[PDB]
Design a protein around this ligand. Structure first.
Ligand SMILES: Cc1cc2nc3c(=O)[nH]c(=O)nc-3n(C[C@H](O)[C@H](O)[C@H](O)COP(=O)(O)OP(=O)(O)OC[C@H]3O[C@@H](n4cnc5c(N)ncnc54)[C@H](O)[C@@H]3O)c2cc1C
Ligand SMILES: Cc1cc2nc3c(=O)[nH]c(=O)nc-3n(C[C@H](O)[C@H](O)[C@H](O)COP(=O)(O)OP(=O)(O)OC[C@H]3O[C@@H](n4cnc5c(N)ncnc54)[C@H](O)[C@@H]3O)c2cc1C
Ligand SMILES: NC(=O)c1ccc[n+]([C@@H]2O[C@H](COP(=O)([O-])OP(=O)(O)OC[C@H]3O[C@@H](n4cnc5c(N)ncnc54)[C@H](O)[C@@H]3O)[C@@H](O)[C@H]2O)c1
Lengths: 274, 271
């Protein structure tokens, strides 16, 4: 897709890493199809992942009782956010596709990437309470996670010691990415990369590249639409009574998080359905 | 005389999180606990893993791998001293309380980093000893979490979805993986809209709970003995155990749902 912009966020310190190789592969593949490609190599930027007062360069509303959510929003609108935050915000605004490339660390994102989310995804910019989930600011955009693990895929199967990978991805894909409005595409999961032989590693790279050629035409993952819920305080943001009645006699729930005490649809967070 | 470690991840001394830390310390000292703190913001704790975490000679600096190198450094004792100081607090401690606000459906970056730099292989886990067999099986941990959203938003029918799913990666994947018995989480919902008189009752309730915290029953995780713990079997549930669960309506846990119903409040209440 020529005219389209991609942001690649990388969270690995080493240029010798397979994560770095997957980043470079993606950039190459995408440029070849005529994408503009911007990067946030968080280690190379020495990105500061800790929220603090110093994120606001102007005057605090209330420095005696500092609240990061309230103050960060004011700073966004009056335009006195720390410039490092703003630079990242501009990359996001510009971008149509966001690829996150990172190793799984303690069942989640690396601290440096977690911090990126905390400092960059500010209220009013990346979400409001009016516009949550499918109605959020980034509904035009598509995001994908590309994850490498130490553990093997068997360990993350339904019968694996670690348990279902779908549950592990839910807080990131739903609670961070979709909450801001992103359409989330199937994750690229690269299991036990340390114990994958060299010829296979090369096929994985070739497979990533091949996938990115038609990435924009992919169907996204299923999350419950916001229209299934009463979006106000008096109703408690609960699923509507009509929708609850329509789901009563279904065997499967809507998603991992909206399991509703029933079975979770197979690979809700890993494969799309039409 | 038992020992408690309180890990706090909030920058502000005016915060309810700070108030809950102080409450816990007070309550616990009164019952004759020794109480150590890791106030991560106040310590200016460095949450980013890097080469600088190893003060000695790298095995292989051309192809640096944090897991392999960090373990060597632990064994030969050339870990950065800030890591080691935290490691000593953990070793000493019987009860570990994590006090933090929920940020983006998870722990703050600074606390996540603490886990990454402090929970090193051989110290906090092996491979031989995962989950209930892990090094910290003598210890108990509890999460104490504040949210902006209300508990309804995190119910089965809430816009955000089941809180049990949100806690699973932390309680199972981090805490229990290293061996901790995990106690029922202390969840303080919609703290932003709770007036001062109520906040004080919440603090009094926390304090009251901590008087008998050690006698509490922990959360249920699938025992490791249900699995074949070796590489050739792929760490899968044993065939006999799979056959015995076939007919059950409910799964074992949030992560081990097995395509069936999740036991109610698996990550929030003990059986
Ligand atoms: C703090 C921490 C916590 C962790 N927690 C977890 C956890 O909870 N769960 C889990 O499953 N894992 C966990 N891990 C493991 C982690 O996910 C893996 O180390 C990571 O995914 C490996 O990716 P890498 O890119 O760093 O691998 P590397 O070891 O850097 O790369 C793997 C192999 O690919 C080779 N390679 C490099 N470039 C190329 C190329 N261009 N072509 C071909 N081969 C190439 C390398 O030389 C090497 O042989 C954790 C690790 C850390 C540090
Ligand atoms: C980056 C980021 C991401 C977030 N993501 C999420 C998310 O995913 N989900 C979610 O639900 N929320 C989220 N939030 C909101 C966040 O969880 C809340 O703002 C937080 O839990 C508030 O708790 P606090 O301790 O900071 O309270 P504060 O607002 O700082 O404190 C509450 C009040 O209690 C008062 N107080 C202190 N001590 C006492 C005392 N002893 N007696 C009486 N009153 C006292 C204080 O003065 C203050 O006025 C996020 C916030 C941030 C910054
Ligand atoms: N960052 C996030 O991802 C995220 C997500 C969800 C919520 N939040 C936070 O939640 C805030 C708002 O939610 P909250 O839980 O703090 O508000 P709340 O539910 O405590 O307040 C609701 C309002 O209605 C009143 N009210 C109380 N009981 C009621 C009842 N039974 N029926 C009707 N009205 C009642 C309250 O006094 C208050 O004025 C947001 O502004 C934000 O700070 C953040």
């Amino acid at each position: 897709m020529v005219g389209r912009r991609a942001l690649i966020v990388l969270a690995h310190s080493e240029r010798t890493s397979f994560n770095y190789a997957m980043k470079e592969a993606a950039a190459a593949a995408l440029k070849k199809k005529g994408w503009e490609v911007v990067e946030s190599d968080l280690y190379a930027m020495n990105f500061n992942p800790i929220i603090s007062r110093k994120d606001i360069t102007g005057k605090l509303k209330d420095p005696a009782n500092f609240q990061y959510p309230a103050e960060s929003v004011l700073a966004y609108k009056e335009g006195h956010l720390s410039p490092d935050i703003v630079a990242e915000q501009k990359k996001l605004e510009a971008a149509d596709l966001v690829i996150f490339q990172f190793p799984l660390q303690w069942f989640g994102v690396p601290a440096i990437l977690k911090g990126w989310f905390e400092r960059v995804f500010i209220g009013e910019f990346a979400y409001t309470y009016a516009a949550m989930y499918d109605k959020g600011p980034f509904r035009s955009k598509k995001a994908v996670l590309s994850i490498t693990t130490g553990g093997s895929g068997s360990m993350y199967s339904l019968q694996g010691i670690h348990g279902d990978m779908n549950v592990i991805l839910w807080p990131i894909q739903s609670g961070i990415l979709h909450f801001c409005g992103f359409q989330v595409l199937e994750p690229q999961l690269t299991y036990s990369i340390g114990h994958t032989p060299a010829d296979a590693r090369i096929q994985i790279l070739e497979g990533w590249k091949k996938r990115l050629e038609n990435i924009w035409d992919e169907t996204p993952l299923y999350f419950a639409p916001s229209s299934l819920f009463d979006l106000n305080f008096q109703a408690g943001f609960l699923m509507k009574k009509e929708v609850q009645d329509e789901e009563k006699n279904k065997k499967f729930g809507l998603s991992v998080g909206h399991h509703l005490g029933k079975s979770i649809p197979t690979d809700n967070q890993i494969k799309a359905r039409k």
